[PDB]
Amino acid sequence: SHTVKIYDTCIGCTQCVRACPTDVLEMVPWDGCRAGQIASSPRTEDCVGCKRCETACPTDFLSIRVYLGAETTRSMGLAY
Amino acid sequence: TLSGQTPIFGGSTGGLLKKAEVEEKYAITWTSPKEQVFEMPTGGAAIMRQGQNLLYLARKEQCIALGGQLRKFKITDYKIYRIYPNGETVYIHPADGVFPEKVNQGREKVRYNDRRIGQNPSPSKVKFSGIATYDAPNS
Amino acid sequence: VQRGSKVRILRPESYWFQDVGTVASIEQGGTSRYPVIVRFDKVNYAGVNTNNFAQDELVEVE
Amino acid sequence: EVRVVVDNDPVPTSFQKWSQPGHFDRTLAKGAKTTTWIWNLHANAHDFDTHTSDLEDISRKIFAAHFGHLAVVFIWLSGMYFHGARFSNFEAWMANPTGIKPSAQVVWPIFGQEILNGDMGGGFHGIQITSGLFQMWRAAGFTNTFQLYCTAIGGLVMAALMLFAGWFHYHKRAPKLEWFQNTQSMLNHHLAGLLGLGSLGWTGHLIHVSLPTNKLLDTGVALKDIPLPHEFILNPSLMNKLYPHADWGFVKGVVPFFTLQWGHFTDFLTFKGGLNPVTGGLWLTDVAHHHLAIAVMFIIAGHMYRTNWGIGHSIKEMLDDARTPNMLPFLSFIGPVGHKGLFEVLTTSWHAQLSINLAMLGSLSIIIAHHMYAMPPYPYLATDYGTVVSLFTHHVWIGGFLIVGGAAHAAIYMVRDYDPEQNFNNVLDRVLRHRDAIISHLAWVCQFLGFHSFAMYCHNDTMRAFGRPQDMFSDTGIQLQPVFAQWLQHIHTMTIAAPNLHDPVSYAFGGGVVAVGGKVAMMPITLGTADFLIHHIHAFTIHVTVLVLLKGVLFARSSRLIPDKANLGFRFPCDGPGRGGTCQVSAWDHVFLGLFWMYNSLSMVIFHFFWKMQSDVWGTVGADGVVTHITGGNFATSSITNNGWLRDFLWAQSTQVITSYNTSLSAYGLMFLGGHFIFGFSLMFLFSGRGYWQELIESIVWAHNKLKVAPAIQPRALSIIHGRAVGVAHYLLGGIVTTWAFFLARMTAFG
Amino acid sequence: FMFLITWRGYWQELIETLAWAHEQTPLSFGYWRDKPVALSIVQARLVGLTHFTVGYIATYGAFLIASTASKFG
Amino acid sequence: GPGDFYVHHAIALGLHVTTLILVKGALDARGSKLMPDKKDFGYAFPCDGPGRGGTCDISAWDASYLAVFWMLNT
Amino acid sequence: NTTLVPCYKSPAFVERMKNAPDSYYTTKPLKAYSQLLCGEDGLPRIALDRLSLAVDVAIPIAIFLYTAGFIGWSGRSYLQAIKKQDKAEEKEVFIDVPLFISCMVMALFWPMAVIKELLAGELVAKDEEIPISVR
Amino acid sequence: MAALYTHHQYIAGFLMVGAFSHAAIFWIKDYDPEQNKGNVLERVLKHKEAIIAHLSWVSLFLGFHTLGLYVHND
Numbered sequence A: 001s002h003t004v005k006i007y008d009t010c011i012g013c014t015q016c017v018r019a020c021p022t023d024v025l026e027m028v029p030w031d032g033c034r035a036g037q038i039a040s041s042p043r044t045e046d047c048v049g050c051k052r053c054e055t056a057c058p059t060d061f062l063s064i065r066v067y068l069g070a071e072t073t074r075s076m077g078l079a080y
Numbered sequence B: 001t002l003s004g005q006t007p008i009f010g011g012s013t014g015g016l017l018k019k020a021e022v023e024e025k026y027a028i029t030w031t032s033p034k035e036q037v038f039e040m041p042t043g044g045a046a047i048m049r050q051g052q053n054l055l056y057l058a059r060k061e062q063c064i065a066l067g068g069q070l071r072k073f074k075i076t077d078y079k080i081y082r083i084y085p086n087g088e089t090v091y092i093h094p095a096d097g098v099f100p101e102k103v104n105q106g107r108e109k110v111r112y113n114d115r116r117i118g119q120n121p122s123p124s125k126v127k128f129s130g131i132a133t134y135d136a137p138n139s
Numbered sequence C: 001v002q003r004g005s006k007v008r009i010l011r012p013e014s015y016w017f018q019d020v021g022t023v024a025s026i027e028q029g030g031t032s033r034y035p036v037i038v039r040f041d042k043v044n045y046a047g048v049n050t051n052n053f054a055q056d057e058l059v060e061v062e
Numbered sequence D: 001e002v003r004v005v006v007d008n009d010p011v012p013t014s015f016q017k018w019s020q021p022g023h024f025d026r027t028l029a030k031g032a033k034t035t036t037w038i039w040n041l042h043a044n045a046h047d048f049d050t051h052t053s054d055l056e057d058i059s060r061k062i063f064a065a066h067f068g069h070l071a072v073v074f075i076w077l078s079g080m081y082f083h084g085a086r087f088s089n090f091e092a093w094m095a096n097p098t099g100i101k102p103s104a105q106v107v108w109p110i111f112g113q114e115i116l117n118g119d120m121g122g123g124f125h126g127i128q129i130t131s132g133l134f135q136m137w138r139a140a141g142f143t144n145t146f147q148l149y150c151t152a153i154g155g156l157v158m159a160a161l162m163l164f165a166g167w168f169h170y171h172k173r174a175p176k177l178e179w180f181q182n183t184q185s186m187l188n189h190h191l192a193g194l195l196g197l198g199s200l201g202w203t204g205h206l207i208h209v210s211l212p213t214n215k216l217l218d219t220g221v222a223l224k225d226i227p228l229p230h231e232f233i234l235n236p237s238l239m240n241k242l243y244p245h246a247d248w249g250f251v252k253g254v255v256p257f258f259t260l261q262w263g264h265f266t267d268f269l270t271f272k273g274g275l276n277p278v279t280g281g282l283w284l285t286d287v288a289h290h291h292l293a294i295a296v297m298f299i300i301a302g303h304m305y306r307t308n309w310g311i312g313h314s315i316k317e318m319l320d321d322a323r324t325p326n327m328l329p330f331l332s333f334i335g336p337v338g339h340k341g342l343f344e345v346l347t348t349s350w351h352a353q354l355s356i357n358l359a360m361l362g363s364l365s366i367i368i369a370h371h372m373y374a375m376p377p378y379p380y381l382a383t384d385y386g387t388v389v390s391l392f393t394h395h396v397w398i399g400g401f402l403i404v405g406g407a408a409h410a411a412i413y414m415v416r417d418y419d420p421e422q423n424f425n426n427v428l429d430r431v432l433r434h435r436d437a438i439i440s441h442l443a444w445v446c447q448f449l450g451f452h453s454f455a456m457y458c459h460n461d462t463m464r465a466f467g468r469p470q471d472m473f474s475d476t477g478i479q480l481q482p483v484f485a486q487w488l489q490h491i492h493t494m495t496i497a498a499p500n501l502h503d504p505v506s507y508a509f510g511g512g513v514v515a516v517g518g519k520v521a522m523m524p525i526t527l528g529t530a531d532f533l534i535h536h537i538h539a540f541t542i543h544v545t546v547l548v549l550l551k552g553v554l555f556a557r558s559s560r561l562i563p564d565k566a567n568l569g570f571r572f573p574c575d576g577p578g579r580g581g582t583c584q585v586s587a588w589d590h591v592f593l594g595l596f597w598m599y600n601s602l603s604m605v606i607f608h609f610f611w612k613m614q615s616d617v618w619g620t621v622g623a624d625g626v627v628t629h630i631t632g633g634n635f636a637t638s639s640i641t642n643n644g645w646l647r648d649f650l651w652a653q654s655t656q657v658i659t660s661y662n663t664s665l666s667a668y669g670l671m672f673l674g675g676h677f678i679f680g681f682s683l684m685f686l687f688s689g690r691g692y693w694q695e696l697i698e699s700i701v702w703a704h705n706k707l708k709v710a711p712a713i714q715p716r717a718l719s720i721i722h723g724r725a726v727g728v729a730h731y732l733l734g735g736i737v738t739t740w741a742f743f744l745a746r747m748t749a750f751g
Numbered sequence E: 001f002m003f004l005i006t007w008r009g010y011w012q013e014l015i016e017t018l019a020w021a022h023e024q025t026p027l028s029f030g031y032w033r034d035k036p037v038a039l040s041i042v043q044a045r046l047v048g049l050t051h052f053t054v055g056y057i058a059t060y061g062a063f064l065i066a067s068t069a070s071k072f073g
Numbered sequence F: 001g002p003g004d005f006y007v008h009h010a011i012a013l014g015l016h017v018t019t020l021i022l023v024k025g026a027l028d029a030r031g032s033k034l035m036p037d038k039k040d041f042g043y044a045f046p047c048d049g050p051g052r053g054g055t056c057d058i059s060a061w062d063a064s065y066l067a068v069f070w071m072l073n074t
Numbered sequence G: 001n002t003t004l005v006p007c008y009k010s011p012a013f014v015e016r017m018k019n020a021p022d023s024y025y026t027t028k029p030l031k032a033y034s035q036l037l038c039g040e041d042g043l044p045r046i047a048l049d050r051l052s053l054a055v056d057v058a059i060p061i062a063i064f065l066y067t068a069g070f071i072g073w074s075g076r077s078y079l080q081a082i083k084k085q086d087k088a089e090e091k092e093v094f095i096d097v098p099l100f101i102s103c104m105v106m107a108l109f110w111p112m113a114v115i116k117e118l119l120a121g122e123l124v125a126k127d128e129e130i131p132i133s134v135r
Numbered sequence H: 001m002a003a004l005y006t007h008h009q010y011i012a013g014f015l016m017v018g019a020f021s022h023a024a025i026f027w028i029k030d031y032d033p034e035q036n037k038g039n040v041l042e043r044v045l046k047h048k049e050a051i052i053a054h055l056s057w058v059s060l061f062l063g064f065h066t067l068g069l070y071v072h073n074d
């Protein structure tokens, strides 16, 4: 149960969604970009916290923040 | 529901543990045109079948690790399910039937802040309040 | 702030705060909220030298 | 079908790419945006597998780089013989190799460092070398410094050949991939032509140079009456007063070999098997017989594999036939596939080969260290106590670094060259498919030994502090005798089946004491409770080193945390702070931690060696036969509490390096402090992270932006992996220089 | 130095293995109420800082007391 | 004496580095160019991932942790 | 301070002269230590009295601070010499030694150069020229 | 006499680290730029890099010439 907030500085480069190993992010239509897209995080209980989405965001001081919060059984990735 | 023939695999040690049938369990289901071999996300190698393939994995990251491997075999028709122990099977990937890199209509901006990240409020503003500085309904 | 002009950043969250960069292109749609693409001679941190900005946090130097 | 196929002038020879460094990587060859580019240019200079993609061009870089490496060793070998030629007391040490200390590498008079030129006996001032070069040149037959000098010349011209051969085989005639992949022909020539002919060549030297020269040097002829080595062959009558049972003529003296009347050779190819009691080394006649036995047995070994004349073995389907319709029933568990697809592993990837060749060169170097103390091969080696310790210690450390490097490339093979299709259900895949049962049982035995080796030292440390020495694991309290090792010590001394060896090999095993210059060359090394406990420290530290290194190989591909750990690479810092934190999950980070465990393990091995010789083996013999050891039986009673290690070994035996100022041992005092600085300095890089350091550069870049003196090569704090590499490179450097200084100051202050 | 040099993800892959061993072995009837995980990043920095401090103080406390109360009364 | 001179500069060096670590950790607690949003993440957090070069020990807590070593040393 | 006396009159230091080999090192230097303020242990020392040593606690300081600034000035002036050339990215990895030498000869008379850097308001960058963090 | 000195200096070292720990908590949680607009506390943040760069100079100065003077004497 992390918190992946997306800010208005996205450019719809789509790179944050590809890096996510757990499919938390996905693109929705938007208008504040030439791409007309913005990241959204509908599945954040699945967020593992790897911040691999933040490494891919190219906007300077990146538009997507993982906010490591209450860690549960699927946000810590336990197979046992 | 879910069905398919399991790949040729001699069984591993990295597979399902007691969390599989007690909390919940995942299943990736894909169709292959060829009888080739893929790397198991739980260590090893298995031969994927000719028709409908079904594989049980402990956590969702393994399924999308394997799903990202299937795209290197030019297979993009996989579906990831989540099996609760009581038995019902949810469809979770791809959630709308199209892959999340693609943009649909009807999806909603969820956890979107309509401000730059730079003007999140100071922690003193939300002092002794339920919210954090990053929800912050201002702007 | 047209293309080719050296411009200064007034965005405190940015790596290039109070540093100059050359404008690469301007977006003429007018609905993108960050039309200016300005290019920098210093990469920020393991990455880019290009960032999108709005009209109001830029000031031209020449 | 084995063939020589090469290219013609594949790579031009110009300085075009010298002026553009980082050309090998496309990311490096676009500009130095930050200082991270500088460090990436060195961490990637030799990873040829990322410069190109085709194995043909990679293998040409490997083969050409070996030549430039052999050039470097020949430069270094030339430097050893040149220093032995004109900067040493080797002439003086040949006359009296007991009272004269071996010394090359004199020191220039500047900065007051002439004090390091200590007195060596014979009026020669220098630094007492402990490399054993002198004890090896005497066994090679060197007598004067002209032979040493011309060998140094013969090595510089030999290094020039290595440099030319490397340029020639990359820029003029580079072999194709078919020439490299016939490993089955390479084994034939390395087993027969290199190791077989090499030890056949050497036993030629031993019989005709070393055996006569060391025969006369044992009768005291004092370097006048020594004939030059060629005068033993030009004058064949000169070797009939020595070894009279042979014939010694061009043709008339060699025919006993062909007519199989080998009894005439029994006087110079002996099988005595002991220590020559006048020099303390092995009998050179017994050594010459060894190399002839080795030569015959390696030339034979080089005919095992099948090159293009039909006859021989094929490794390809000797491996492929180790399936399980055909195994012993108790080890028939390794797959119907078995070893298929594993000849393509060890042929299509150099990291697979480098991992094995390092783990066996490392294990060989440690075996060699154990064999060159228990049966010294060189004259006057065993009595030079500073050389015995510094040769054992050098080769244990060298052998332990190589072993860790064999586990590095076992992991680089996994995340770069491991191929699932050629490795389906075979012997390699079935290991990855149960890698939790391998690590569970390794992590248990690592923990069983941890309590039953170290925590028994804390039992002893507590009973001796309570004043209960009768309930401590002593020879006097609760004895833990090495029953199975004292048994072997009994087996190896009653067999003198093997009856012909009338003299016991390795006086360490038992029987007799050899004193050469009054100093003991070698004694029996008895094993008591202190040797039970110290051997299980060794078992414990080796296992955890294996546990760290094997974990990095098995879980290099994936884990339950990160199922796609192979896509992140071999050398990545982490996968973010999620899953609670995945710091140091890479396979590189298990090499980095196994280096510490190699340091822990081997520094305990050399401490076990150093104290057990000083207390039980080394010493001096008086005029009655009793042996007064250097510390005097100290190991048996006080090495069982690790307070005894700190006071009777570390505090007591550091007296020579602590009180070393204003003496000739002054430089070991500085190295001993220097090693302490570097160890403490390493902990800056190990305990901290680069977020603090990057944020400190920003405050320092500001002070340069203020005075308009900022650089355009933007200062970046070192990478996470770089900062961990710096930490382990300094911890191991500092913690070894302090041990190197402590060993040699202690043993050059004695002899 | 163990908590300060070696970091978290090494220990999670090793605890994940021990958790496999416990589940698959007979006669081990205990089972964790809460999943064993390698202790967190900011905690090991604190656990290792406590040992460094306790070892800094016990070593010097014992030195200073014994090196002064042995030469003298 | 002269031996007392040198230790008072070791002591002065000690008090300055451990002040540098703590002052850097207090004044950069609000954030610096490596992560300008440290106030949102709290006081004791591990890092901000391996991106932007790697941000190990970036929190203000890790400057208090790093300065206990220098305090004990001093 | 008056505990320090010259090594001329110091019983603990003539003893240093008595048991001294020569070899190059303990005669030619050790005569020159006779002019130093010498403790009650025969060890030359650096004291700060008054004009007695006011020139000797200025020869090392003037020689260092000049050549430290000389290194700093030539290194600084070479950096702006290549920032203006717009080639400073690779001008730093490949040192332009004719330009660097010409920046060293500017740094011989650096103390008078820094004054006219300062008096022109050109040495120090203005505060909103400088990249900073959020603060 | 020896233990009492070492006790209170080590106690004082920890109190100095915690004085600067809670300075860092104060900046993060209970500090705002609104009330402290233009005051003495906000003027420090205006030049927090001038302070840190100067503790960096003194630390570098005092360690080069104390270690360097010790290991010259060594």
Ligand code: F6C
Residues within 6 Å of the ligand: D440, D441, D443, D444, D447, E018, E021, E022, E025, E027, E028, E029, E030, E031
């Ligand atoms: C109940 C519960 C339980 C059980 C049962 O049921 C168990 C079991 C097991 C088995 C099967 C095995 C083997 C055993 C042996 O050998 O050795 C011993 C040990 C012990 C520990 C022993 C123990 C046993 C029991 C616990 C006893 C009891 C005690 C008492 C009761 C207490 C008292 C009470 C009071 C209150 C205090 C094991 C192990 C391991 N562990 Mg294990 N456990 C557990 C718990 C725990 C905890 C808490 C922890 C943390 C500390 C851990 C940890 C660990 C590690 C590291 C390891 C290893 O290494 C190993 C292995 O892996 O293999 C391989 N683990 N495991």
Ligand code: CLA
Residues within 6 Å of the ligand: D011, D012, D013, D014, D015, D016, D017, D018, D060, D061, D062, D064, D065, D067, D068, D069, D163, D164, D165, D166, D167, D170
């Ligand atoms: C003067 C002769 C000469 C010239 C002009 C070249 C030129 C070239 N070589 Mg070549 N080479 C030569 C001799 C030469 N070589 C010899 C004698 C060998 C056998 C070792 C090689 C083996 C070789 C290989 C395997 C490769 C090249 C490559 C190249 C090309 C890339 C340049 C480069 O490597 O950047 C670097 C510039 C340098 C000056 C590097 C020198 C570093 C030396 C070797 C360090 C070793 C000694 C070191 C000091 C050890 C002491 C350490 C101590 C301080 C602790 C370039 C056109 C590469 C290529 O083909 O590009 C795609 C390629 O991979 N060469």
Ligand code: CLA
Residues within 6 Å of the ligand: E056, E057, E058, E060, E061, E062, E064, E065, H002, H003, H004, H006, H007, H008, H010, H011, H014
């Ligand atoms: C090396 C530095 C140093 C030295 C020489 C001392 C010396 C002393 N301390 Mg100590 N102490 C120190 C550092 C030091 N302290 C630090 C950094 C702390 C903060 C944790 C403490 C906290 C502390 C407490 C609470 C007490 C002392 C006390 C004492 C005095 C009696 C103990 C003794 O005989 O000496 C032995 C040498 C030692 C190193 C032992 C010191 C005692 C340790 C540090 C107590 C640790 C507290 C621990 C958290 C609680 C234990 C857990 C409990 C549940 C079992 C003695 C003069 C006692 C006192 O006040 O006298 C009446 C006492 O009550 N100190």
Ligand code: CLA
Residues within 6 Å of the ligand: E050, E054, F043, F044, F061, F064, F065, H014, H015, H016, H017, H018, H019, H021, H025
């Ligand atoms: C009057 C003094 C005082 C007070 C009231 C506080 C109060 C507080 N501090 Mg603190 N602090 C202080 C002094 C103080 N501090 C000093 C002197 C230091 C320097 C070391 C610190 C450095 C510090 C840091 C880095 C942090 C705090 C934090 C906190 C807050 C949470 C407390 C907590 O973590 O839960 C309870 C704490 C514990 C239960 C401690 C755990 C165990 C410790 C390490 C003792 C272990 C000793 C060991 C068992 C002894 C060995 C026994 C034997 C073997 C010898 C709290 C408001 C936290 C904060 O600000 O929240 C955001 C925070 O992260 N402080």
Ligand SMILES: CC1=C(C/C=C(\C)CCC[C@H](C)CCC[C@H](C)CCCC(C)C)C(=O)c2ccccc2C1=O
Residues within 6 Å of the ligand: D684, D685, D686, D688, D689, D690, D693, D694, D716, D717, D718, D719, D720, D722, D723, D724
């Ligand atoms: C100190 C430190 C740094 C900073 C390390 C640095 C900046 C390396 C210092 C090496 C200096 C910069 C060498 C530079 C030499 C210059 C080129 C000067 C040479 C000029 C003369 C030859 C003329 C880290 O980046 C780091 C990262 C992760 C964990 C721990 C640490 C860590 O402890």
Ligand code: SF4
Residues within 6 Å of the ligand: A006, A009, A010, A011, A012, A013, A014, A015, A016, A017, A038, A039, A056, A057, A058, A059, A062, A063, A064
């Ligand atoms: S959050 Fe980052 S990666 Fe994702 S669309 Fe926006 S800018 Fe691109």
Ligand code: SF4
Residues within 6 Å of the ligand: D573, D574, D575, D576, D577, D581, D582, D583, D584, D689, D720, E041, F046, F047, F048, F049, F050, F054, F055, F056, F057
């Ligand atoms: S950035 Fe550093 S602290 Fe954060 S997860 Fe990676 S290694 Fe750990």
Ligand SMILES: [Ca+2]
Residues within 6 Å of the ligand: D470, D471
């Ligand atoms: Ca008893």
